[PDB]
Nucleic acid binder design. Structure first.
Lengths: 122, 122
RNA sequence: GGCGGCGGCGGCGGCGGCC
RNA sequence: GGCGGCGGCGGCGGCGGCC
């Protein structure tokens, strides 16, 4: 299936995750998890994120309105399907959801939600 | 139970809702729905909202960090419980969730989420 | 980080019902 | 707007298991 994502997955191995745990804390993870769900299908990413401008800029590029619409439209037809973006970072999860007819607005809110969460006060 | 909310509920009657439907469209409802959930308990509000500054200011006052913490803390103890804010307006729902230890951060994201959604481009 | 399992609570979407 | 019902998909939180 074609992904809504434009960067590949970066899930740490169990060993990398242990090492990072040994050397740091839920407020300083390796990165964050995000997902786009259209109908019955879900696409997932773990992306490394270090709370700098360069890093925020990188991870904001993991999907766009267009990449999302291209992916989701594979699943469209007459009836409306449920669409969901979810992001989790530092113990907070934000999910943005609605029906496919409102996908443009869900993307707009999803991107703002992502930026606000990834810049939230330490 | 003590509510996290500081404004009373404004749910339209079935007749008011029909009349409003006859005279207007999912992009122009009477208002929006919001909820705060702590453990097993959920508190809900429908609030009238007309997309003006005065109205946005009013409905942003429906809860605060303090009102939320006072309400939620009734349900606290040793073990962490799940906390959730949900808001729905114009076909988009945003839910902010995490555990009670992170309640301050959930509130910060919940208030931003509320403002962004209620000001979203028509 | 990932994958099962057992409780609990939310959310979206479809279909219909009562009001 | 509210309340049932029947599919589907997600989220949080608790408890434990494998890795």
């Amino acid at each position: 299936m074609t992904s809504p994502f434009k960067l590949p997955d970066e899930s740490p191995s169990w060993t990398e995750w242990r090492l990072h745990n040994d050397e740091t804390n839920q407020d300083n993870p390796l990165g964050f998890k995000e997902s786009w769900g259209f109908g019955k299908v879900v696409f997932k990413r773990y992306l490394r994120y270090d709370r700098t401008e360069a890093s925020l800029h990188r991870v904001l590029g993991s999907w766009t309105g267009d990449s999302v619409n291209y992916a989701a439209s594979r699943f469209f037809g007459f009836d409306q399907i449920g669409c969901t973006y979810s992001i989790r970072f530092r113990g907070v999860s934000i999910t943005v959801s609605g029906g496919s007819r409102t996908l443009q607005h869900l993307c707009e809110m999803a991107i703002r939600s992502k930026q606000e969460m990834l810049q939230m006060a330490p």
